[PDB]
Coordinates of N, CA and C in Angstrom, one line a residue:
Chain A
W1 N 18.4 -6.6 18.5 CA 18.3 -6.7 19.7 C 18.2 -8.2 19.8
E2 N 16.5 -8.3 19.1 CA 16.8 -10.0 19.9 C 16.1 -10.9 17.9
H3 N 16.1 -12.3 18.4 CA 16.1 -13.4 17.2 C 14.8 -14.0 17.4
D4 N 15.1 -14.6 16.3 CA 13.6 -15.6 15.7 C 14.3 -17.1 16.1
Chain B
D1 N 5.1 -16.6 -23.3 CA 5.3 -17.8 -21.6 C 6.0 -18.1 -21.4
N2 N 7.1 -16.8 -20.9 CA 8.2 -16.6 -19.9 C 7.7 -16.0 -19.0
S3 N 6.2 -15.5 -19.1 CA 5.4 -15.0 -17.6 C 4.4 -15.6 -17.0
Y4 N 4.4 -15.6 -16.0 CA 3.0 -16.2 -15.1 C 1.9 -14.9 -15.6
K5 N 0.5 -15.7 -16.2 CA -0.6 -15.1 -16.3 C -0.5 -14.5 -14.7
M6 N -0.7 -12.9 -15.0 CA -1.0 -12.2 -14.0 C -2.2 -11.4 -14.7
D7 N -2.7 -11.5 -15.3 CA -4.2 -10.5 -15.4 C -5.2 -11.1 -15.7
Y8 N -5.1 -12.4 -14.1 CA -6.2 -13.1 -13.5 C -7.8 -11.4 -13.6
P9 N -9.2 -11.5 -13.2 CA -9.9 -10.3 -12.3 C -8.8 -10.1 -10.9
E10 N -8.6 -11.4 -10.1 CA -7.8 -10.8 -9.1 C -6.3 -11.4 -9.0
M11 N -5.4 -10.5 -8.4 CA -3.9 -11.4 -8.2 C -4.3 -12.2 -6.9
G12 N -4.8 -12.3 -6.0 CA -4.9 -13.5 -5.0 C -5.2 -13.5 -3.9
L13 N -4.7 -14.4 -3.2 CA -5.3 -13.6 -1.2 C -3.9 -13.6 -0.8
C14 N -3.7 -13.2 0.1 CA -2.1 -12.7 0.8 C -3.1 -13.0 2.3
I15 N -2.4 -14.2 2.3 CA -2.2 -15.2 3.9 C -1.7 -14.2 5.3
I16 N -1.8 -13.5 6.3 CA -0.2 -13.2 7.0 C -0.6 -13.7 8.3
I17 N 0.4 -15.1 9.0 CA 0.4 -15.2 9.8 C 1.3 -14.3 10.7
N18 N 0.5 -13.7 12.3 CA 1.3 -13.0 12.7 C 1.5 -13.5 14.0
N19 N 2.5 -14.5 14.9 CA 2.6 -14.8 16.0 C 3.6 -13.8 17.1
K20 N 2.8 -13.1 17.8 CA 3.7 -12.5 18.7 C 3.8 -12.7 20.3
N21 N 2.5 -14.0 20.5 CA 2.9 -14.1 22.2 C 2.5 -15.1 22.2
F22 N 4.0 -16.1 22.8 CA 3.4 -17.6 22.8 C 3.0 -18.1 24.4
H23 N 2.3 -19.4 24.4 CA 2.1 -19.9 25.9 C 3.7 -19.7 27.0
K24 N 3.1 -19.9 28.2 CA 4.4 -20.1 29.7 C 5.1 -21.0 29.1
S25 N 4.7 -22.5 28.4 CA 4.9 -23.7 28.6 C 5.8 -23.8 27.2
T26 N 6.2 -23.1 26.8 CA 7.0 -23.2 25.8 C 8.4 -22.9 25.4
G27 N 8.9 -21.8 26.0 CA 9.6 -21.1 26.1 C 10.1 -20.2 25.3
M28 N 8.9 -19.0 24.6 CA 9.4 -18.3 24.0 C 9.5 -16.9 24.0
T29 N 10.3 -16.2 23.9 CA 10.1 -14.6 23.9 C 9.3 -13.7 23.0
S30 N 8.1 -13.5 23.3 CA 7.3 -12.4 22.7 C 8.0 -11.7 21.9
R31 N 7.5 -11.6 20.8 CA 8.4 -11.2 19.6 C 7.9 -9.8 19.1
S32 N 8.7 -9.0 19.7 CA 8.3 -7.3 19.8 C 8.9 -7.2 18.5
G33 N 8.3 -6.6 17.4 CA 8.1 -5.5 16.5 C 7.2 -6.3 15.2
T34 N 7.4 -7.5 15.6 CA 6.6 -8.4 14.3 C 5.1 -7.6 14.0
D35 N 4.8 -6.8 15.6 CA 3.6 -6.1 14.5 C 3.8 -5.2 13.4
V36 N 4.9 -4.3 13.3 CA 5.5 -3.9 12.6 C 5.5 -4.1 11.5
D37 N 6.3 -5.2 11.4 CA 5.6 -5.9 10.1 C 4.8 -6.4 9.1
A38 N 4.3 -6.8 10.4 CA 2.8 -7.3 10.0 C 2.0 -6.0 9.2
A39 N 1.7 -5.1 9.9 CA 1.4 -3.8 8.9 C 2.3 -3.1 7.6
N40 N 2.7 -3.0 8.2 CA 4.0 -3.3 6.9 C 3.8 -3.5 5.6
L41 N 3.3 -4.8 5.6 CA 3.5 -6.5 4.6 C 1.7 -5.9 3.9
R42 N 0.6 -5.6 5.3 CA -0.8 -5.2 4.4 C -0.6 -4.2 3.5
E43 N 0.1 -2.5 3.9 CA 0.5 -1.5 3.0 C 0.7 -2.4 1.6
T44 N 1.7 -3.1 2.2 CA 2.9 -3.5 0.7 C 2.1 -4.3 -0.3
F45 N 1.1 -5.1 0.5 CA 0.6 -6.1 -0.4 C -0.7 -5.3 -0.8
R46 N -1.4 -4.5 -0.2 CA -2.3 -3.9 -0.2 C -2.8 -3.1 -1.9
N47 N -0.9 -2.5 -2.0 CA -0.5 -2.0 -3.4 C -0.7 -2.8 -4.0
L48 N -0.2 -3.9 -4.4 CA 0.2 -5.2 -4.9 C -1.1 -5.0 -5.9
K49 N -2.2 -4.7 -5.7 CA -3.7 -5.3 -5.5 C -4.3 -6.9 -5.3
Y50 N -3.4 -7.0 -3.5 CA -3.8 -8.1 -3.9 C -5.2 -8.6 -2.0
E51 N -5.8 -9.4 -2.3 CA -6.7 -9.1 -0.9 C -6.2 -9.7 0.6
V52 N -6.0 -9.3 1.4 CA -5.0 -9.5 2.3 C -6.0 -9.1 3.6
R53 N -5.2 -11.0 4.2 CA -6.2 -11.2 5.2 C -5.1 -11.5 6.5
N54 N -5.1 -11.0 7.5 CA -3.9 -11.0 8.2 C -5.1 -12.0 9.5
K55 N -3.7 -12.8 10.4 CA -4.5 -13.2 11.5 C -3.2 -13.6 13.1
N56 N -4.2 -12.8 13.8 CA -3.1 -12.8 14.7 C -2.5 -14.6 15.8
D57 N -1.5 -14.4 16.6 CA -1.6 -15.1 17.2 C -2.4 -16.9 17.4
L58 N -2.0 -17.6 16.4 CA -2.4 -18.1 16.0 C -1.6 -19.8 16.5
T59 N -2.4 -21.2 16.8 CA -2.1 -22.5 17.5 C -1.8 -23.2 16.3
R60 N -1.4 -24.0 16.4 CA -0.8 -25.0 15.7 C -1.7 -25.2 14.9
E61 N -3.0 -26.5 15.0 CA -4.0 -26.6 15.2 C -4.7 -25.4 14.0
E62 N -5.7 -23.9 14.6 CA -5.8 -22.6 13.6 C -5.3 -23.1 12.7
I63 N -3.6 -23.0 13.0 CA -2.5 -23.0 11.4 C -3.0 -23.8 10.2
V64 N -2.8 -24.5 10.7 CA -2.9 -26.1 9.6 C -4.6 -26.1 9.0
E65 N -5.5 -25.5 9.7 CA -7.0 -25.1 9.5 C -7.6 -23.8 8.8
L66 N -6.9 -23.2 9.3 CA -6.6 -21.8 8.2 C -6.7 -22.0 7.2
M67 N -4.8 -22.6 7.2 CA -4.8 -23.1 5.5 C -5.0 -24.1 4.6
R68 N -5.7 -25.3 5.8 CA -6.4 -26.2 5.2 C -8.3 -25.5 4.6
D69 N -8.3 -24.8 4.6 CA -9.7 -24.0 4.4 C -9.2 -23.1 3.4
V70 N -7.8 -22.5 3.1 CA -7.7 -21.8 1.8 C -7.6 -22.6 0.9
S71 N -6.7 -23.8 0.8 CA -6.7 -24.5 -0.1 C -7.7 -25.2 -0.5
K72 N -9.2 -25.2 1.0 CA -10.4 -25.6 -0.4 C -11.3 -23.9 -1.3
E73 N -10.2 -23.6 -0.8 CA -11.1 -22.0 -1.5 C -11.2 -22.1 -2.8
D74 N -11.9 -21.0 -4.4 CA -11.8 -21.8 -5.4 C -10.8 -20.3 -5.6
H75 N -9.9 -20.4 -6.5 CA -8.5 -19.5 -6.9 C -9.0 -19.5 -8.3
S76 N -9.9 -20.4 -8.3 CA -10.0 -20.0 -10.1 C -10.1 -18.3 -11.0
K77 N -10.4 -17.6 -10.4 CA -10.2 -16.2 -10.9 C -8.7 -15.9 -10.3
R78 N -8.3 -16.1 -9.6 CA -7.2 -15.4 -9.1 C -5.8 -16.0 -9.9
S79 N -4.5 -14.8 -10.0 CA -3.8 -15.3 -10.6 C -2.2 -15.8 -10.2
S80 N -2.9 -15.7 -8.0 CA -1.4 -16.2 -7.4 C -1.6 -16.9 -6.0
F81 N -0.5 -16.6 -5.1 CA -1.5 -16.7 -3.7 C 0.2 -16.9 -3.2
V82 N 0.0 -15.6 -2.2 CA 0.6 -15.5 -1.1 C 0.5 -15.8 0.8
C83 N 1.8 -16.8 1.1 CA 1.7 -16.5 2.3 C 2.2 -16.3 3.6
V84 N 2.5 -15.6 4.0 CA 3.7 -15.0 5.5 C 3.3 -15.3 6.4
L85 N 4.3 -16.0 6.9 CA 4.6 -16.0 8.0 C 5.6 -15.8 9.7
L86 N 5.1 -15.0 10.2 CA 6.1 -14.8 11.2 C 6.1 -14.7 12.5
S87 N 7.4 -15.8 13.4 CA 6.8 -16.3 14.1 C 8.3 -17.2 14.6
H88 N 8.3 -17.8 15.3 CA 9.9 -18.5 16.2 C 9.7 -19.6 14.8
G89 N 10.9 -20.4 14.8 CA 10.9 -21.3 14.3 C 12.3 -21.6 14.4
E90 N 11.8 -23.2 13.5 CA 13.4 -23.7 13.8 C 13.2 -24.7 11.6
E91 N 14.9 -25.7 11.9 CA 14.5 -25.8 10.3 C 13.3 -26.7 10.0
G92 N 12.6 -25.8 8.4 CA 11.5 -26.9 9.0 C 9.8 -27.2 8.9
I93 N 10.2 -25.8 10.6 CA 9.3 -26.1 11.1 C 9.1 -24.4 12.0
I94 N 7.8 -24.0 11.9 CA 7.2 -23.1 12.0 C 6.5 -22.8 13.3
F95 N 6.9 -22.6 14.3 CA 5.8 -22.1 15.6 C 4.7 -21.4 15.9
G96 N 3.9 -22.3 16.6 CA 2.3 -21.5 16.3 C 2.4 -21.4 18.2
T97 N 1.4 -20.7 18.2 CA 1.5 -20.2 20.2 C 2.0 -20.7 21.1
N98 N 1.3 -22.1 20.4 CA 1.3 -23.4 21.6 C 2.3 -24.3 21.3
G99 N 2.6 -24.5 19.8 CA 3.6 -25.8 19.1 C 4.1 -25.2 17.9
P100 N 4.8 -26.1 18.0 CA 5.9 -26.4 16.5 C 4.7 -27.1 15.5
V101 N 4.8 -26.8 13.6 CA 4.6 -27.3 12.9 C 4.8 -27.4 11.9
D102 N 5.2 -28.2 11.1 CA 6.4 -28.9 10.2 C 5.7 -27.3 8.8
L103 N 6.5 -27.0 8.2 CA 6.2 -26.0 7.2 C 6.0 -27.0 5.8
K104 N 6.5 -28.5 6.1 CA 5.7 -29.4 4.6 C 4.3 -29.5 5.2
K105 N 3.8 -29.8 5.8 CA 2.5 -29.7 6.9 C 1.7 -28.8 5.6
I106 N 2.0 -27.3 5.9 CA 1.5 -26.6 5.8 C 1.6 -26.4 4.4
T107 N 2.9 -26.2 2.9 CA 3.1 -26.1 2.0 C 1.8 -27.3 1.1
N108 N 2.4 -28.3 1.6 CA 0.9 -29.8 1.1 C -0.3 -29.1 0.7
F109 N -1.3 -28.9 1.3 CA -1.9 -28.2 1.1 C -2.3 -27.3 -0.1
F110 N -1.1 -26.5 -1.0 CA -1.4 -26.0 -2.1 C -0.5 -26.1 -3.0
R111 N -0.4 -27.8 -3.1 CA 0.5 -29.1 -4.1 C -0.9 -28.9 -5.6
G112 N 0.2 -28.5 -7.0 CA -1.0 -29.6 -7.7 C -1.6 -29.9 -8.0
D113 N -2.3 -31.4 -6.6 CA -2.8 -32.0 -7.1 C -4.1 -32.0 -5.9
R114 N -3.3 -31.0 -4.9 CA -4.3 -30.8 -3.8 C -5.4 -29.5 -3.6
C115 N -5.2 -28.6 -4.6 CA -5.4 -26.9 -4.8 C -5.4 -27.2 -6.3
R116 N -6.7 -27.5 -7.1 CA -6.4 -27.5 -8.3 C -6.8 -25.8 -9.3
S117 N -7.1 -25.3 -8.2 CA -7.5 -23.7 -8.6 C -6.3 -23.1 -8.7
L118 N -4.8 -23.7 -8.4 CA -3.8 -23.0 -8.4 C -3.0 -23.6 -9.1
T119 N -2.8 -25.0 -9.6 CA -2.4 -25.4 -10.2 C -1.7 -24.7 -11.3
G120 N -0.1 -24.2 -11.9 CA 0.3 -23.5 -13.1 C 0.7 -21.8 -11.8
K121 N 0.2 -22.0 -11.4 CA 0.8 -20.6 -10.6 C 1.2 -20.4 -9.7
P122 N 1.8 -18.9 -9.6 CA 2.5 -18.7 -8.1 C 1.7 -18.8 -6.8
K123 N 2.8 -20.2 -6.1 CA 2.6 -19.9 -4.8 C 3.8 -19.6 -3.8
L124 N 3.1 -18.0 -3.6 CA 5.2 -17.7 -2.9 C 5.0 -17.6 -1.0
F125 N 5.8 -18.1 -0.6 CA 5.9 -18.5 1.0 C 6.5 -17.7 1.4
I126 N 6.2 -16.8 2.0 CA 8.0 -15.5 2.6 C 8.0 -15.5 4.4
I127 N 8.9 -15.9 4.4 CA 9.2 -16.2 6.1 C 9.9 -16.1 6.6
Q128 N 9.7 -15.4 7.9 CA 10.2 -15.4 9.0 C 10.4 -15.3 10.0
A129 N 11.8 -16.4 10.2 CA 11.8 -17.3 11.9 C 12.6 -18.0 11.8
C130 N 12.8 -18.6 12.7 CA 14.8 -18.6 12.7 C 14.8 -20.6 12.1
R131 N 16.1 -20.7 11.8 CA 15.9 -22.1 11.1 C 17.2 -22.9 11.7
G132 N 17.6 -22.4 12.9 CA 18.9 -23.5 13.7 C 19.3 -22.0 14.8
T133 N 20.6 -22.3 15.3 CA 21.1 -21.2 16.3 C 22.6 -20.6 15.8
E134 N 22.7 -21.1 14.7 CA 24.5 -20.7 14.0 C 24.4 -19.4 14.0
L135 N 25.3 -18.8 14.5 CA 25.2 -17.4 14.5 C 26.8 -16.5 13.2
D136 N 26.3 -15.7 12.2 CA 26.6 -15.6 11.4 C 27.8 -14.4 11.6
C137 N 28.7 -14.4 12.0 CA 30.1 -13.4 12.1 C 30.9 -12.9 11.4
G138 N 29.9 -13.1 10.0 CA 30.5 -12.3 9.0 C 31.9 -12.0 8.4
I139 N 32.4 -11.3 7.9 CA 34.0 -11.2 6.9 C 33.9 -9.4 6.7
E140 N 35.5 -9.0 6.9 CA 34.9 -7.5 6.5 C 35.0 -7.6 5.1
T141 N 35.0 -6.4 4.3 CA 35.4 -6.3 3.2 C 35.6 -4.8 2.5
Chain C
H1 N 1.3 -34.5 -21.0 CA 0.8 -33.6 -20.9 C 1.1 -33.3 -19.6
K2 N 1.9 -33.2 -18.1 CA 1.7 -32.8 -17.2 C 2.6 -32.5 -16.3
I3 N 2.8 -31.7 -15.1 CA 3.7 -30.9 -13.9 C 3.7 -31.5 -13.0
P4 N 5.3 -31.4 -12.3 CA 5.7 -31.6 -11.4 C 4.1 -30.6 -9.6
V5 N 4.5 -31.8 -9.0 CA 3.3 -31.2 -7.8 C 4.1 -30.4 -7.0
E6 N 5.2 -29.8 -7.1 CA 6.2 -29.6 -5.9 C 6.7 -28.4 -7.1
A7 N 5.9 -28.2 -8.6 CA 6.5 -27.1 -9.4 C 5.6 -25.7 -8.8
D8 N 6.0 -24.4 -9.4 CA 5.4 -23.4 -9.2 C 5.8 -22.6 -7.8
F9 N 6.0 -23.6 -7.2 CA 6.5 -22.8 -5.8 C 7.6 -22.1 -5.6
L10 N 7.9 -21.1 -4.4 CA 8.5 -20.0 -4.3 C 8.6 -19.8 -2.2
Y11 N 10.1 -20.2 -2.0 CA 10.0 -19.6 -0.3 C 11.7 -18.8 -0.5
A12 N 10.5 -17.7 0.0 CA 12.1 -16.1 0.2 C 12.0 -16.7 1.8
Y13 N 13.3 -17.3 2.6 CA 13.3 -17.6 4.2 C 14.1 -15.9 4.4
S14 N 14.2 -15.7 5.2 CA 14.3 -14.9 6.5 C 16.1 -14.7 6.4
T15 N 16.6 -16.3 6.6 CA 18.3 -16.4 6.9 C 18.2 -17.8 6.5
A16 N 19.6 -18.0 6.5 CA 19.8 -18.9 5.4 C 19.8 -20.5 6.2
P17 N 19.7 -22.0 6.2 CA 19.7 -22.7 6.9 C 20.6 -23.1 8.1
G18 N 19.8 -23.6 9.4 CA 20.9 -23.6 10.3 C 21.1 -22.7 11.0
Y19 N 20.2 -21.2 10.9 CA 21.0 -19.8 11.0 C 20.3 -19.4 11.5
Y20 N 19.8 -18.1 12.9 CA 19.3 -17.3 13.2 C 18.7 -15.9 12.5
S21 N 17.7 -15.9 12.9 CA 16.7 -14.8 11.6 C 16.9 -13.3 13.2
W22 N 17.4 -12.1 12.4 CA 17.4 -10.8 13.9 C 16.0 -10.0 13.1
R23 N 15.2 -9.6 14.4 CA 14.9 -8.5 14.2 C 14.9 -7.2 15.2
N24 N 14.9 -6.1 14.5 CA 14.5 -4.7 15.8 C 13.3 -4.5 16.4
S25 N 12.9 -4.6 17.5 CA 11.7 -4.5 18.2 C 11.4 -2.8 17.8
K26 N 11.8 -1.8 17.5 CA 10.8 -1.1 17.0 C 10.6 -1.0 15.8
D27 N 11.7 -1.7 14.5 CA 11.6 -1.2 13.5 C 11.2 -2.6 12.5
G28 N 11.4 -4.0 12.9 CA 10.5 -4.2 12.6 C 11.9 -6.1 12.4
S29 N 11.8 -6.9 11.9 CA 12.9 -8.0 11.3 C 13.2 -7.3 10.1
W30 N 14.7 -7.3 10.0 CA 15.3 -6.7 8.5 C 14.8 -7.4 7.8
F31 N 14.3 -8.7 7.5 CA 14.4 -9.3 5.8 C 12.8 -8.3 5.9
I32 N 11.6 -8.5 6.7 CA 10.4 -8.1 6.1 C 10.5 -6.5 5.9
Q33 N 11.4 -6.0 6.4 CA 11.3 -4.7 6.7 C 12.5 -4.4 4.9
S34 N 13.3 -4.7 4.5 CA 14.0 -4.8 3.3 C 13.3 -5.3 2.4
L35 N 12.5 -6.3 2.1 CA 11.6 -7.0 1.6 C 10.5 -6.2 1.4
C36 N 9.6 -5.0 2.3 CA 8.6 -4.3 1.5 C 9.4 -2.8 0.6
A37 N 10.6 -2.7 1.4 CA 10.8 -1.2 0.7 C 11.6 -1.9 -0.9
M38 N 11.9 -3.1 -0.6 CA 12.2 -3.2 -1.9 C 10.8 -3.2 -3.0
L39 N 10.4 -3.7 -2.9 CA 9.0 -4.4 -3.3 C 8.4 -3.0 -3.6
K40 N 8.0 -2.0 -2.8 CA 7.5 -0.6 -2.8 C 8.7 0.1 -3.4
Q41 N 9.5 -0.7 -3.8 CA 10.4 0.3 -4.8 C 10.7 0.0 -6.4
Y42 N 11.0 -1.8 -6.4 CA 10.7 -2.4 -7.7 C 9.7 -3.1 -8.4
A43 N 9.1 -3.2 -7.8 CA 8.0 -4.1 -8.2 C 6.9 -3.5 -8.8
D44 N 7.1 -2.2 -9.8 CA 6.8 -2.1 -11.1 C 8.0 -1.8 -12.3
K45 N 8.7 -2.9 -11.9 CA 9.9 -2.4 -13.6 C 11.2 -3.9 -12.8
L46 N 11.2 -4.5 -12.2 CA 11.7 -5.9 -11.8 C 11.2 -6.8 -11.6
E47 N 12.2 -7.6 -11.8 CA 10.9 -9.3 -11.8 C 11.3 -10.1 -10.2
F48 N 10.0 -10.8 -9.7 CA 10.6 -10.8 -8.7 C 11.7 -11.4 -8.0
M49 N 12.7 -12.1 -8.4 CA 13.7 -12.7 -8.4 C 14.9 -12.4 -8.2
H50 N 14.9 -10.8 -8.9 CA 15.6 -9.9 -9.3 C 15.5 -8.6 -8.2
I51 N 14.6 -8.5 -7.6 CA 14.1 -7.9 -6.2 C 14.5 -8.6 -4.9
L52 N 14.2 -9.7 -5.1 CA 14.7 -10.6 -3.7 C 16.0 -10.5 -3.9
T53 N 17.1 -10.9 -5.1 CA 18.4 -10.8 -5.1 C 18.9 -9.5 -4.0
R54 N 18.2 -8.1 -4.6 CA 18.3 -6.2 -3.6 C 18.0 -7.1 -2.1
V55 N 17.1 -7.6 -1.9 CA 16.9 -7.5 -0.8 C 17.8 -8.5 0.2
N56 N 18.4 -9.5 -0.7 CA 19.5 -10.0 0.0 C 20.8 -9.3 0.0
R57 N 21.0 -8.8 -0.8 CA 22.3 -6.9 -1.0 C 21.7 -6.6 0.5
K58 N 21.0 -5.9 1.0 CA 19.8 -5.1 2.0 C 20.1 -5.3 2.8
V59 N 20.1 -6.5 3.3 CA 20.0 -7.2 4.6 C 21.2 -7.8 4.6
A60 N 22.1 -8.5 3.8 CA 23.7 -8.8 3.9 C 24.3 -7.4 3.8
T61 N 24.1 -6.4 3.3 CA 25.6 -5.3 3.5 C 25.2 -4.2 4.9
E62 N 23.5 -4.0 4.9 CA 23.1 -2.8 5.7 C 22.2 -3.2 7.3
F63 N 23.0 -4.0 7.8 CA 22.5 -4.8 9.0 C 23.8 -5.5 9.4
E64 N 23.3 -5.6 11.2 CA 24.3 -6.0 12.0 C 23.4 -5.8 12.9
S65 N 23.2 -7.5 13.9 CA 23.7 -7.2 15.1 C 24.0 -6.1 16.1
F66 N 23.1 -6.1 17.5 CA 24.0 -5.6 18.5 C 23.3 -5.6 19.6
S67 N 24.3 -6.0 20.5 CA 24.3 -6.9 21.9 C 24.7 -6.4 23.0
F68 N 24.1 -6.1 24.0 CA 25.7 -6.4 25.0 C 25.7 -7.6 25.7
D69 N 25.1 -8.9 25.3 CA 25.4 -9.8 25.4 C 26.9 -10.5 23.8
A70 N 27.6 -10.1 24.0 CA 29.0 -10.5 23.1 C 28.2 -11.6 21.7
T71 N 28.3 -12.9 23.1 CA 27.4 -14.0 21.9 C 26.7 -13.5 21.1
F72 N 25.7 -12.4 20.8 CA 24.6 -12.2 19.9 C 25.1 -11.1 19.4
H73 N 26.2 -10.7 19.4 CA 26.9 -8.9 19.2 C 27.4 -9.0 18.3
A74 N 27.4 -7.9 16.5 CA 28.1 -7.7 16.1 C 27.1 -9.5 14.9
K75 N 26.5 -9.1 14.6 CA 26.1 -10.8 13.4 C 25.6 -10.9 12.4
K76 N 25.4 -11.1 11.6 CA 25.3 -11.0 10.1 C 23.7 -12.3 9.6
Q77 N 23.2 -11.3 8.2 CA 22.1 -12.3 8.1 C 22.1 -12.5 6.7
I78 N 21.6 -13.4 6.2 CA 21.5 -13.1 5.2 C 20.3 -14.5 4.2
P79 N 19.7 -13.7 3.6 CA 18.2 -14.6 3.9 C 18.3 -15.6 2.2
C80 N 17.4 -16.5 2.4 CA 17.4 -17.6 1.5 C 16.7 -17.7 0.3
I81 N 16.3 -17.3 -1.3 CA 15.3 -17.7 -1.8 C 15.3 -19.2 -2.3
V82 N 14.1 -19.7 -2.3 CA 14.1 -21.5 -3.1 C 13.2 -21.5 -3.5
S83 N 13.7 -21.1 -5.0 CA 12.7 -21.5 -6.0 C 12.7 -22.0 -6.7
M84 N 11.1 -23.1 -7.1 CA 10.7 -24.2 -7.8 C 10.0 -23.4 -8.6
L85 N 9.8 -22.4 -8.9 CA 9.1 -22.0 -10.1 C 9.7 -22.2 -12.0
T86 N 8.7 -21.4 -12.8 CA 9.2 -22.1 -14.2 C 8.7 -21.2 -14.6
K87 N 8.6 -19.9 -14.5 CA 8.5 -18.3 -15.1 C 8.9 -17.7 -14.4
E88 N 8.5 -16.7 -14.9 CA 9.0 -15.2 -14.4 C 8.4 -14.7 -13.7
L89 N 7.8 -13.8 -12.2 CA 7.0 -13.0 -11.6 C 7.4 -11.4 -11.9
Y90 N 6.3 -11.0 -12.3 CA 5.9 -9.7 -12.0 C 4.9 -8.9 -11.7
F91 N 4.5 -8.3 -10.4 CA 3.5 -8.1 -10.0 C 2.1 -6.6 -10.6
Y92 N 2.4 -7.0 -12.3 CA 1.5 -5.9 -13.1 C 1.7 -7.0 -14.6

């Protein structure tokens, strides 16, 4: 879902 | 002579810097899930016989300080050194809860001349962070 | 008889240069979860470099992003192993  | 000596009394340290919450004046979305990664690492490395030391939500200064001190420790009886960084980041930059810091500044503390007890010993830096903003659309196989 | 001060270093990046790194809300980042799984399964018979190659394949093949925003949907990732080591690494 998310990224860094 | 092809393999590093891993029969020292101790395998070594395993510093894990876990950053999930960032200051509102930075613009970073809380890294939900990093808690699972931190815990998963801990158990994995404990089985590998490492002295695992976890650290949560560190700032620029605190990070650099933790590393400076660890590099000033006596690793003479240790066979290696592992450091896990879990946080936001850019190319060659790890993010502390309040600000960014060059990965180079951290790694430089463990160089062959700034840490004689680790000279000739494997220094592993596992990094979970971004290195830019490019998206890999991939291709079918 | 001396060595480079940059030798014996090994960096295991979760993604390639200039690229994003993906993370799941409940399972954890693809990299870490693959790295831990490969270590738990091969750290008793494989050299570290070989283990990280496995980590690369698992991350590149078994993962794909999902988002309601097309821009971040269906994206891939490849880990980047950067080794300045001079010997083989075995955890035992």
